From Swiss-Prot:
Heme b binds at H172. It catalyses: 2 Fe(II)-[cytochrome c] + H2O2 + 2 H(+) = 2 Fe(III)-[cytochrome c] + 2 H2O. Changing W188F: Substantially diminished activity. GO terms for cellular component: mitochondrial intermembrane space; mitochondrial matrix; mitochondrion. It comes from the Eukaryota. CCP1 precursor is processed by the rhomboid protease PCP1, which cleaves the N-terminal hydrophobic transit peptide. The m-AAA protease (composed of YTA12/RCA1 and YTA10/AFG3) is required for CCP1 maturation: m-AAA protease promotes membrane dislocation of the CCP1 transmembrane segment within the transit peptide to ensure the correct positioning of CCP1 within the membrane bilayer, allowing intramembrane cleavage by PCP1. The lineage of its organism: Eukaryota, Fungi, Dikarya, Ascomycota, Saccharomycotina. Coiled coil: none annotated. The chain holds residues 71 to 361 of 361 of the full protein. Belongs to the peroxidase family. Cytochrome c peroxidase subfamily. This is Cytochrome c peroxidase, mitochondrial. GO terms for biological process: cellular response to oxidative stress; hydrogen peroxide catabolic process; response to reactive oxygen species. Its main location: mitochondrion. GO terms for molecular function: cytochrome-c peroxidase activity; heme binding; metal ion binding; peroxidase activity. Its cofactor is heme b.
C-alpha cells in the first residue's frame, strides 16, 4: 500500500499560508475556550490522533487519507474530547474546500504549535482523501495506564525512537486531562496555552504522589495541582528516557528542534513524496505578518 502525495491543483505556498492564517485568526477569535486555554492544545492533539493510527508494517491508517472524517474513527473512544477541535476546523474547510482533510487536520496542529510560541514546523501538502472503507479500526492510539516498555514498543509502530518519543511527549506542556474524556484529571503545568519545555521541568522538579482519581484510574499528582499520566511518569522511571528528559529540561532550544523534526515526521508517516514534490513550507505566524 503506497500513498503518493498529490499537490492540490494549482495550489502553492501562498494558498496554504491563507489557510494557516484562517486557522490562526480563529484561534484568536475563540481564545476564551476552556477558561482561556483556547483551542491550540486540542488542535495539536487532533493532528496527533489522526496521524497516530499509522501502522508502519502495512501502511494502514496515518494522516494521508483524512479518515477521521468518518464516524468509525471520529467516534473512537480514544478520540473523546476532540470533537470541538473537529468542529473548529469545519468552517475553515468550507472556506477553503480545495484543501484535503488530512492536509487541513495536520496543518491545524502546525498552526497551533507555532501560534503558541512553539518551534517552526515545516509542513508538506498533498494528502488525498481516501474512502470510508480505508478507515482504521479503533484501538491504535495508546493507553495512558502503562509503563515505559509499553511506550517504547508502542511508538516503534510509528517508527519513533527514544529521542523522538520523549520529544513528542513534550506536547503535554499544553492543555489538560478531563475525567469525562479520558478518565484523568488536571493539567501538566501552569502555562498550558504556551509551547515550552515545562513538561520536562515539572516531571523532574515536582514531588509526585500516586493517587486514585474520581474515575478509579491512578495518576501521579503534585501539591501544585499538576498531574502526570503513568505513561508520562514512565519517562523518569526508565533510565534512557530519563537522560533525555533531563536534556530537554535544561535546553528548550534543543527540545524545540527535536520536537519540530519528530512532529513533522509524525504528520508525514505513510506518505511517499515524489522527487519533484515542492519543498516543505514554513509558514509565518500572524505576528510575523503583523496580522
Ligand atoms: C503514550 C502516548 C500518549 C498518551 C497515552 C497520551 C494521553 C493523553 C491523555 C490521557 C490526554 C488527556 C485527554 C483529555 O482528557 O481530554 C492527553 C491530552 C493531550 N495530549 Fe497526549 N498522549 C500521548 C502522546 C501525545 C503526543 C505524542 C502528543 C503530541 C505530539 C500529545 C499531545 C496532547 C495534547 C496537546 C493534549 C491536550 C489536548 C487538550 O487539552 O484537550 N500526546 N493525552
Ligand atoms: Mn480538552
Amino acid at each position: 500500500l503506497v500513498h503518493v502525495a498529490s499537490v492540490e491543483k494549482g495550489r502553492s505556498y501562498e494558498d496554504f499560508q491563507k489557510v494557516y492564517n484562517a486557522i490562526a485568526l480563529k484561534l484568536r477569535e475563540d481564545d476564551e475556550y476552556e477558561n482561556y486555554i483556547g483551542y491550540g492544545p486540542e488542535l495539536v492533539r487532533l493532528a496527533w490522533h489522526i496521524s497516530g493510527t499509522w501502522d508502519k508494517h502495512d501502511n494502514t491508517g496515518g494522516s494521508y487519507g483524512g479518515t477521521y472524517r468518518f464516524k468509525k474513527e471520529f467516534n473512537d473512544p480514544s478520540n473523546a474530547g476532540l470533537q470541538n477541535g473537529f468542529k473548529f476546523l469545519e468552517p475553515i474547510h468550507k472556506e477553503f474546500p480545495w484543501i484535503s482533510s488530512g492536509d487541513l487536520f495536520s496543518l491545524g496542529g502546525v498552526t497551533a504549535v507555532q501560534e503558541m510560541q512553539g518551534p517552526k514546523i515545516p509542513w508538506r501538502c498533498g494528502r488525498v482523501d481516501t474512502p470510508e472503507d480505508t478507515t482504521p479500526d479503533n484501538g491504535r492510539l495508546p493507553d495512558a495506564d502503562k509503563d515505559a516498555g509499553y511506550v517504547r514498543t508502542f511508538f516503534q509502530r510509528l517508527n519513533m525512537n527514544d529521542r523522538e518519543v520523549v520529544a513528542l511527549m513534550g506536547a503535554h506542556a499544553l492543555g489538560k486531562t478531563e475525567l469525562k474524556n479520558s478518565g484523568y484529571e488536571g493539567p501538566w503545568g501552569a502555562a498550558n496555552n504556551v509551547f515550552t519545555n515545562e513538561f520536562y521541568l515539572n516531571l523532574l522538579n515536582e514531588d509526585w504522589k500516586l493517587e486514585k482519581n474520581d474515575a478509579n484510574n491512578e495518576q501521579w499528582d503534585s501539591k501544585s495541582g499538576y498531574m502526570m499520566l503513568p505513561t508520562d511518569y514512565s519517562l523518569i522511571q526508565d533510565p534512557k528516557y530519563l537522560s533525555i528528559v533531563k536534556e530537554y529540561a535544561n535546553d528548550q532550544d534543543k527540545f524545540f528542534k527535536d520536537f519540530s523534526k519528530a512532529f513533522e515526521k509524525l504528520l508525514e508517516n505513510g506518505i511517499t513524496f515524489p522527487k519533484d514534490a515542492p519543498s516543505p513550507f514554513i509558514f509565518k505566524t500572524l505576528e510575523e505578518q503583523g496580522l
